[PDB]
Enzyme design. Structure first.
Site, PDB file in Angstrom:
ATOM      1  N   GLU A   1      24.314  18.763  30.465  1.00 40.73           N
ATOM      2  CA  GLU A   1      24.541  17.352  30.052  1.00 40.73           C
ATOM      3  C   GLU A   1      24.603  17.222  28.503  1.00 40.73           C
ATOM      4  O   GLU A   1      25.428  16.434  27.975  1.00 40.73           O
ATOM      5  CB  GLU A   1      23.422  16.413  30.566  1.00 40.73           C
ATOM      6  CG  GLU A   1      23.256  16.441  32.086  1.00 40.73           C
ATOM      7  CD  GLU A   1      24.598  16.299  32.836  1.00 40.73           C
ATOM      8  OE1 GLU A   1      25.452  15.495  32.406  1.00 40.73           O
ATOM      9  OE2 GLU A   1      24.784  16.935  33.905  1.00 40.73           O
TER      10      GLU A   1
ATOM     11  N   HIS B   1      34.466  19.202  30.796  1.00 44.06           N
ATOM     12  CA  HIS B   1      34.430  20.328  31.725  1.00 44.06           C
ATOM     13  C   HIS B   1      35.366  21.467  31.382  1.00 44.06           C
ATOM     14  O   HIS B   1      36.485  21.230  30.965  1.00 44.06           O
ATOM     15  CB  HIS B   1      34.540  19.845  33.193  1.00 44.06           C
ATOM     16  CG  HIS B   1      33.343  19.076  33.633  1.00 44.06           C
ATOM     17  ND1 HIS B   1      33.414  17.850  34.264  1.00 44.06           N
ATOM     18  CD2 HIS B   1      32.031  19.330  33.450  1.00 44.06           C
ATOM     19  CE1 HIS B   1      32.182  17.420  34.524  1.00 44.06           C
ATOM     20  NE2 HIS B   1      31.322  18.280  33.999  1.00 44.06           N
TER      21      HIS B   1
HETATM   22  C1  LIG Z   1      27.693  22.845  35.401  1.00 40.70           C
HETATM   23  C2  LIG Z   1      26.205  22.923  35.403  1.00 40.70           C
HETATM   24  C3  LIG Z   1      25.718  24.114  34.885  1.00 40.70           C
HETATM   25  C4  LIG Z   1      24.339  24.316  34.825  1.00 40.70           C
HETATM   26  C5  LIG Z   1      23.854  25.433  34.433  1.00 40.70           C
HETATM   27  N1  LIG Z   1      23.445  26.469  34.066  1.00 40.70           N
HETATM   28  C6  LIG Z   1      23.448  23.347  35.317  1.00 40.70           C
HETATM   29  C7  LIG Z   1      23.967  22.152  35.830  1.00 40.70           C
HETATM   30  C8  LIG Z   1      25.347  21.911  35.877  1.00 40.70           C
HETATM   31  N2  LIG Z   1      25.733  20.700  36.510  1.00 40.70           N
HETATM   32  C9  LIG Z   1      25.051  19.423  36.309  1.00 40.70           C
HETATM   33  C10 LIG Z   1      25.984  18.254  36.543  1.00 40.70           C
HETATM   34  N3  LIG Z   1      26.675  18.379  37.849  1.00 40.70           N
HETATM   35  S1  LIG Z   1      26.974  17.152  38.781  1.00 40.70           S
HETATM   36  O1  LIG Z   1      25.880  16.182  38.700  1.00 40.70           O
HETATM   37  O2  LIG Z   1      27.258  17.635  40.098  1.00 40.70           O
HETATM   38  N4  LIG Z   1      28.405  16.600  38.281  1.00 40.70           N
HETATM   39  C11 LIG Z   1      29.725  17.114  38.695  1.00 40.70           C
HETATM   40  S2  LIG Z   1      30.959  15.984  38.109  1.00 40.70           S
HETATM   41  C12 LIG Z   1      29.801  14.726  37.563  1.00 40.70           C
HETATM   42  C13 LIG Z   1      28.520  15.506  37.287  1.00 40.70           C
HETATM   43  C14 LIG Z   1      28.497  16.037  35.859  1.00 40.70           C
HETATM   44  O3  LIG Z   1      29.235  16.944  35.443  1.00 40.70           O
HETATM   45  N5  LIG Z   1      27.598  15.545  35.041  1.00 40.70           N
HETATM   46  O4  LIG Z   1      27.642  16.109  33.771  1.00 40.70           O
HETATM   47  C15 LIG Z   1      27.355  19.632  38.175  1.00 40.70           C
HETATM   48  C16 LIG Z   1      26.657  20.867  37.616  1.00 40.70           C
HETATM   49 ZN   LIG Z   2      29.361  17.789  33.562  1.00 40.25          ZN
END
Ligand SMILES: Cc1cc(C#N)ccc1N1CCN(S(=O)(=O)N2CSC[C@@H]2C(=O)NO)CC1
Ligand SMILES: [Zn+2]
Ligand SMILES: [Ca+2]
Ligand SMILES: [Ca+2]
Ligand SMILES: [Ca+2]
Ligand SMILES: [Zn+2]
Length: 164
Positions: free
Chosen positions: A122, A131
């Site tokens: 985040e 992303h």
């Molecule tokens: C990409 C990622 C990498 C790590 C690590 N290490 C830890 C967490 C992480 N996330 C956290 C955020 N999510 S999520 O809540 O599912 N998501 C997918 S699209 C909207 C949301 C998101 O990206 N928030 O930033 C996906 C994966």
């Molecule tokens: Zn994200």
């Protein structure tokens, strides 16, 4: 690989402040503070930025735990699903990071979600990365718990594209 936000949104000062506005009951406060401090330490090493914890609603990055509709019109969704979201740098809600307290927040393996790793992803959005399409990049949008260093070349290339 890496993506930025429309207009390469970025911070225009080097000394970033953050405020932990509230706390989940899942973990002791000092464990939560440490999880967020470690997630900032990951980005401070690879940027000219510093992150200072303050106690002020004027902090650049305001961190909240929230459930369902929590004040910004992008509601959370209960257990699993959406874990957290952050806004790109800028004023007010911009740069802030919110965490779904319907999740079980952990530090460990496979018991719910690592607050440190989610915060590290985040905080990459709160510094201006979107992303990545590179698998295994911290900013590649899927959760997988790892004990390894979270940053990949693609994340470091992105943040260097923004901050130098
Ligand atoms: C990409 C990622 C990498 C790590 C690590 N290490 C830890 C967490 C992480 N996330 C956290 C955020 N999510 S999520 O809540 O599912 N998501 C997918 S699209 C909207 C949301 C998101 O990206 N928030 O930033 C996906 C994966
Ligand atoms: Zn994200
Ligand atoms: Ca903000
Ligand atoms: Ca959720
Ligand atoms: Ca919780
Ligand atoms: Zn929110």
């Amino acid at each position: 690989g890496f993506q930025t936000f429309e207009g390469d949104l970025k911070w225009h000062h080097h000394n970033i402040t953050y405020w932990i506005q509230n706390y989940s009951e899942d973990l002791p406060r000092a464990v939560i503070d440490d999880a967020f401090a470690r997630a900032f330490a990951l980005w401070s090493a690879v940027t000219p930025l510093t992150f200072t914890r303050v106690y002020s609603r004027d902090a650049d990055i305001v961190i909240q735990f929230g459930v369902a509709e929590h004040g910004d019109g992008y509601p959370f969704d209960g257990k699993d699903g959406l874990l957290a979201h952050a806004f790109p740098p800028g004023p007010g809600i911009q740069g802030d990071a919110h965490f779904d307290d319907d999740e079980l927040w952990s530090l460990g393996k496979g018991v719910g979600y690592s607050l440190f790793l989610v915060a590290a992803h985040e905080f990459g959005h709160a510094l201006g990365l979107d992303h990545s399409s590179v698998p295994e990049a911290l900013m590649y949008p899927m959760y997988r718990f790892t004990e390894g260093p979270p940053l990949h070349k693609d994340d470091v290339n992105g943040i260097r594209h923004l901050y130098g």
